C-alpha cells in the first residue's frame, strides 16, 4: 500500500521475530529514513503493546536519540515505524576501524551515549537491549540511541541495567577491536565476575562501576555525567 507507493526500498538493515527494518526513501521528500515493518493484528492484546512503541517515540525529542517521522498500518497485516536515517557507522562499526586510538572522540562519544540514556531514563522508560549495533552515528558523528550478544545483558528490575550494558560498550570502545569471537567471549567474560592486560585509569574506573553485579551500585546516567571521571 502506502509502503510500495510513496517509498523505494534500498537495503534491509536488520531480520528478526521484530520483523525487519529497512533503510527506504521517500519519493516526494527525496529524503531516506530507517522503516520498522512488524507484523500485527488489529484490535489485539500484542497490537496495544506495540503500539506502545509509536506513542514512546513520538514524545522523544533529543539530539542523542533516533528521530521518529510517522508510523502506519496496512493491509491489517503491518505496522511501518519511519525514523530518521543516521548515514555514518554503527558504533559498532566505529569501535572495529580502531576508535580506541582517538580517546577525545572516544569520551564525546561516550558522553553522547550518557545524554540519551539520562533523557529516556529521565522519562520513565529502560531500553533493556542497549549494545553496539543499536547505537548509530549521523553525518556530523554525533551518537543517536536505537532499538530493532547476551554479553551486554546484566546478571539480574530497574533502569541501571543499560548502564551495565554502556560498561560494556565502553570498553570495547576503549580497547582494540577482537577480530575472533572466541577473543570476545573471554575478555568480555572476565569484566563479569565478584579486565585484558593490554589495557587508561580514568576510563577503568567508570567500566569498574557500571559492570557491578549489583545494579544498586552501580551509577545513574545523570550520576556519572555529574561524577568527576569523565571531562
Ligand atoms: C522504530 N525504531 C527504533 N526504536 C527505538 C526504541 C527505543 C529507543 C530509545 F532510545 F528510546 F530506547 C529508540 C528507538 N529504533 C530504530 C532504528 C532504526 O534504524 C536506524 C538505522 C540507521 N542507520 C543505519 O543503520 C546505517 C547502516 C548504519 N539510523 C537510524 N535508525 C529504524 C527504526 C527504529
Known amino acids: 500500500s502506502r509502503y510500495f507507493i510513496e517509498f523505494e526500498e534500498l537495503q534491509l538493515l536488520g531480520k528478526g521475530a521484530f520483523g525487519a527494518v529497512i533503510k527506504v526513501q521517500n519519493k516526494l521528500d527525496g529524503c531516506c529514513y530507517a522503516v520498522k515493518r512488524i507484523p500485527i493484528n488489529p484490535a489485539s492484546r500484542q497490537f496495544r503493546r506495540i503500539k506502545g512503541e509509536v506513542t514512546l517515540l513520538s514524545r522523544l525529542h533529543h539530539e542523542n536519540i533516533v528521530r521518529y517521522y510517522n508510523a502506519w498500518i496496512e493491509n491489517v497485516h503491518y505496522l511501518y515505524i519511519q525514523m530518521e536515517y543516521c548515514e555514518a557507522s554503527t558504533l559498532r562499526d566505529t569501535i572495529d576501524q580502531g576508535l580506541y586510538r582517538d580517546t577525545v572522540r572516544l ?6 551515549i550518557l545524554d540519551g540514556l539520562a533523557y529516556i531514563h529521565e522519562k520513565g522508560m529502560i531500553h533493556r537491549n542497549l549494545k553496539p549495533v543499536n547505537i ?10 536505537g532499538d530493532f550478544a547476551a554479553l551486554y545483558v546484566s546478571p539480574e528490575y530497574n533502569q541501571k541495567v543499560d548502564l551495565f550494558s554502556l560498561g560494556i560498550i565502553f570498553f570495547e570502545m576503549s580497547y582494540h577491536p577482537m577480530v575472533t569471537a572466541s577473543e570476545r567471549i573471554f575478555v568480555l567474560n572476565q569484566l563479569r565476575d565478584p579486565f585484558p592486560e593490554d589495557f587508561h585509569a580514568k576510563q577503568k574506573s567508570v567500566i569498574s562501576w557500571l559492570l557491578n553485579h549489583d545494579p544498586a551500585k552501580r551509577p545513574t546516567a545523570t550520576e556519572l555525567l555529574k561524577s568527576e571521571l569523565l571531562p
Open 136 to 145: 548509530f552515528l549521523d553525518s556530523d558523528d554525533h551518537v543517536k540511541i
Open 107 to 112: 569520551w564525546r562519544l561516550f558522553r553522547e
